[PDB]
Amino acid sequence: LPPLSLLDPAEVKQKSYSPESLEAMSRLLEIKLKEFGVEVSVDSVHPGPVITRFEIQPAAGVKVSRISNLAKDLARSLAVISVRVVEVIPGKTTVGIEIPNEDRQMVRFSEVLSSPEYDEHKSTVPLALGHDIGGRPIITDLAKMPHLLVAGTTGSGKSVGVNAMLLSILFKSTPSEARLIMIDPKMLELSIYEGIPHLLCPVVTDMKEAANALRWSVAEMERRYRLMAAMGVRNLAGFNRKVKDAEEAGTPLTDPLFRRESPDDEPPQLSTLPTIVVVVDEFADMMMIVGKKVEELIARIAQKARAAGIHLILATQRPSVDVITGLIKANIPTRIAFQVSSKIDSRTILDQGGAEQLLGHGDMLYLPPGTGLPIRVHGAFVSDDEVHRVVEAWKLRGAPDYIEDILA
Amino acid sequence: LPPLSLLDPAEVKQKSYSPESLEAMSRLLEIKLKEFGVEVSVDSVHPGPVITRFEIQPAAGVKVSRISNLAKDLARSLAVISVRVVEVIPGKTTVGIEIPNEDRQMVRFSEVLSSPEYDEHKSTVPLALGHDIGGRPIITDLAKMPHLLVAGTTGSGKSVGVNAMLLSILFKSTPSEARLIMIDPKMLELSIYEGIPHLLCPVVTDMKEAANALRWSVAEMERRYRLMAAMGVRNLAGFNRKVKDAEEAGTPLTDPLFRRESPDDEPPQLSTLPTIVVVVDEFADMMMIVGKKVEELIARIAQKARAAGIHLILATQRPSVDVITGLIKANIPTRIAFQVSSKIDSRTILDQGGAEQLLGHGDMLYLPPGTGLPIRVHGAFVSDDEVHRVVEAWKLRGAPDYIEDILA
Ligand SMILES: Nc1ncnc2c1ncn2[C@@H]1O[C@H](COP(=O)(O)OP(=O)(O)OP(O)(O)=S)[C@@H](O)[C@H]1O
Ligand SMILES: Nc1ncnc2c1ncn2[C@@H]1O[C@H](COP(=O)(O)OP(=O)(O)OP(O)(O)=S)[C@@H](O)[C@H]1O
Ligand SMILES: [Mg+2]
Ligand SMILES: [Mg+2]
Structure with a gap:
């Protein structure tokens, strides 16, 4: 019975994640992963409220578990705070690489x-x-x-x-x-x-x-x-x-x-x-x-x-x-x-x-x-x-x- | 020469830190520190944009370095994420205990x-x-x-x-x-x-x-x-x-x-x-x-x-x-x-x-x-x-x- 108005209002969402920087990061991703033992190419990008997911397509053979274990090292080589590796993306053959947005809402x-x-x-x-x-x-x-x-x-x-x-x-x-x-x-x-x-x-x-x-x-x-x-x-x-x-x-x-x-x-x-x-x-x-x-x-x-x-x-x-x-x-x-x-x-x-x-x-x-x-x-x-x-x-x-x- | 308007606007500051919860935390602080080897009493509270500082007056004898080393344990006993211990507060005899605000702006x-x-x-x-x-x-x-x-x-x-x-x-x-x-x-x-x-x-x-x-x-x-x-x-x-x-x-x-x-x-x-x-x-x-x-x-x-x-x-x-x-x-x-x-x-x-x-x-x-x-x-x-x-x-x-x- 208590009103939802008792809660705090939603805060503004000044987003803006220019496709510019997103292409660069996609670019860096392939580059950086390559330096490690993995060939990859970015298939698509999905910006969100907290993170941005970069779907990638590993070359045949490479073990996706290998990418998962490189999370720490990859984040480092990218100078970002964290990286989450999504081994399988329901309904697709791609691997997810999720990167925290600078200003998370x-x-x-x-x-x-x-x-x-x-x-x-x-x-x-x-x-x-x-x-x-x-x-x-x-x-x-x-x-x-x-x-x-x-x-x-x-x-x-x-x-x-x-x-x-x-x-x-x-x-x-x-x-x-x-x-x-x-x-x-x-x-x-x-x-x-x-x-x-x-x-x-x-x-x-x-x-x-x-x-x-x-x-x-x-x-x-x-x-x-x-x-x-x-x-x-x-x-x-x-x-x-x-x-x-x-x-x-x-x-x-x-x-x-x-x-x-x-x-x-x-x-x-x-x-x-x-x-x-x-x-x-x-x-x-x-x-x-x-x-x-x-x-x-x-x-x-x-x-x-x-x-x-x-x-x-x-x-x-x-x-x-x-x-x-x-x-x-x-x-x-x-x-x-x-x-x-x-x-x-x-x-x-x-x-x-x-x-x-x-x-x-x-x-x-x-x-x-x-x-x-x-x-x-x-x-x-x-x-x-x-x-x-x-x-x-x-x-x-x-x-x-x-x-x-x-x-x- | 480039305009400041090229930057992002300042976000709202919906603060509100009711004196209510502040008295309770002051209350808990004394309680929790006592469980450790330190007697203390809160002298004042200064809420800020990111943290709130509770100045405390240690009983004679107790080494302020002792409080500093308890920061981890104290944060834990208070169920807060972090605590900063300020050993000396310019122009005062008090010790500072700084605690992060739930919603930091x-x-x-x-x-x-x-x-x-x-x-x-x-x-x-x-x-x-x-x-x-x-x-x-x-x-x-x-x-x-x-x-x-x-x-x-x-x-x-x-x-x-x-x-x-x-x-x-x-x-x-x-x-x-x-x-x-x-x-x-x-x-x-x-x-x-x-x-x-x-x-x-x-x-x-x-x-x-x-x-x-x-x-x-x-x-x-x-x-x-x-x-x-x-x-x-x-x-x-x-x-x-x-x-x-x-x-x-x-x-x-x-x-x-x-x-x-x-x-x-x-x-x-x-x-x-x-x-x-x-x-x-x-x-x-x-x-x-x-x-x-x-x-x-x-x-x-x-x-x-x-x-x-x-x-x-x-x-x-x-x-x-x-x-x-x-x-x-x-x-x-x-x-x-x-x-x-x-x-x-x-x-x-x-x-x-x-x-x-x-x-x-x-x-x-x-x-x-x-x-x-x-x-x-x-x-x-x-x-x-x-x-x-x-x-x-x-x-x-x-x-x-x-x-x-x-x-x-
Ligand atoms: N002053 C700040 N206010 C709010 N968030 C911040 C601030 N400084 C850093 N961050 C967060 O951390 C990110 C930037 O961290 P950096 O300053 O690059 O960290 P770093 O200490 O240099 O180490 P990295 O992540 O290895 S580069 C931003 O994208 C934010 O999400
Ligand atoms: N969903 C969230 N969104 C933004 N900040 C959050 C969120 N959940 C937690 N926090 C931050 O973390 C604080 C609360 O963390 P808790 O949920 O109590 O963490 P905890 O895992 O229980 O461990 P503690 O700190 O030992 S209580 C809040 O005051 C925020 O500053
Ligand atoms: Mg850095
Ligand atoms: Mg908890």
Whole structure:
């Protein structure tokens, strides 16, 4: 219900990337790559808001992996700050060489959310990530992911990305449509959402309580499954349809699971269930303080919480095999990698290299479900101050409704 | 003569840094520092265009060097990208803790040059650096430096800084007022100035020719000294005064050094001498390819070229003791350090730590002459494209005038 006008306006886009300099760079590219062990010719150029992609056609034989490993050296020989090598460009035989624009224009949240893709999204938990390399809005749906793993080192834009996702939901769903459980071992990053009506419990700081929060989630998931079974529905959307039709028909449904034990008892009237999202700002700590029990709970939620409408968003600044385990990854195919420190760290999160070539400040590689190759997305910027406003707007529309059993 | 309108406009400054969040951060700071081995209390807050400085008053005893070493950990504990620790604040007993603003506003060249400090600067070689932490224009004078050393690692803003300095001169001085010798071993960064009338020779790429360029400079310096001696003047400003007064008096001076050897010979009429600037994009190579001969020439130019109106600007991306030797430093007190990789690298350039705590993208520590402490300056941004325009504007006002003896 809170107005999008609470956000900061989109900034001017004084672009101008004269075809002049673009031909020269194309020219330099071929020259510089040649000095290395690779023959190449520029096929086309695509200027964007943050980067410019120069599609190139390698000579037969040359291993594209060879170009990828030359990224550092090529950027140097070109005197540019960074270079991202795109090994394969969907639908083409060309290789991508992406180069940062001198004056990159920031991508504002208000800009992404003002897109029809978002304004008309039906999901209860859409996530407006940002703009793609051509500047087109990239709006996703957490419900279809159906879980998300997020990594990136300091200054990469992980926390801003996490806030953009929380605000995507807060701008489209009311507390009866979506509820959240936030886990933030340190105080900082997520402490500000404290109090909004969407919260199921206060921001979790204690790791043991974090563990309980996941157990509660599992319990609620199985509880929703018994409900859906008793109702003859396959998922949350179906459940909510049934309950909604019965009401509109002047015949509200009664909890088919309620067992009367006292003459006094009356079956409670069913109501639509909210989509639940569990967001962990940093779960490397959980995986360290608690351990195996945490993996177990995560792995269980990931495997079957989708139908129950319970979704996980796990973010980590420490992308190690100890934190992002194969057990965690096996049931969470959707990945988002902001800038990471090494190719090794890139593979742990994406099972692929490349996130080490990102710029930082929101720059990311998004790996949607049933996709082998990630698409580059320029994370939308949302300031802690904008977060504070929306949060205040929500604390005015409803008081906190914590359930002191979740952390118990 | 080329119009400032050739530059890009200053971008909006949607700031807003509510005193709210500033009190909280002041609050966290004391909290977080306490967790480390340091008691502290915030005395005041000064929000700026790029950073916000929180002055703090350490408890008696605690070593300010202790806070400096905690910058990394402190930034981490605060969940911010970077923290700069200012050990002493001129005229105060406080210590500075500088924190980057979420949405930093870029500082545009047009904005700095539009300041009266620049527009009314008399020097032939003023260098508009950018904005200080409070957003005030910092315009310097190369002639009073009288030489400048510049360091910074990749993506720090060294080359943008060097272009802003070259354009500072190109927007105030005509070729009869200022001439340049550009040395750029690689092609990239400085190759674009090729052809402007100000150039004394083509952009130098060969290291041996770079060596000759420096020798020519020494020769020209001594030649100007004999000229000034013969004219009874102490410096270039004085020389140019004399030659200018004589002309206005209908009596142009004659080269007092010209020795007639033929009946044919006629003493040439003197003319005002241009201020000469030698800019090396990367002299780490020179110091490596040639060696000791290059140190010697640099050391000689640095020691006595000021009066002769000849000035050096030496920039390096590889700040090692092998490159920035004490010999070089003894005669070049003015320093500019953009972000560097380590405290060691910071000491090599500033003989002090701190450049390792910079943000990059133009952020710098400027050490003016007769000063022990550097002032933070947010470098003014100038795109390669803006440089291209100004270059074209100059190539229309004058043809190249190379002296094929300088590199010979
Ligand atoms: N999408 C973005 N667009 C522009 N700047 C961004 C973006 N995301 C992040 N930044 C910059 O980085 C800051 C926020 O970074 P975070 O998202 O908190 O980074 P982090 O990866 O969580 O690591 P930290 O700094 O340790 S919190 C902002 O204040 C900006 O200055
Ligand atoms: N003063 C500045 N303001 C904003 N962005 C800047 C500034 N200086 C540098 N940048 C960014 O960095 C780029 C230029 O960096 P350079 O100044 O060439 O860096 P460098 O330190 O010389 O190292 P490179 O990238 O190896 S050339 C610009 O294209 C911008 O994207
Ligand atoms: Mg963070
Ligand atoms: Mg450079």
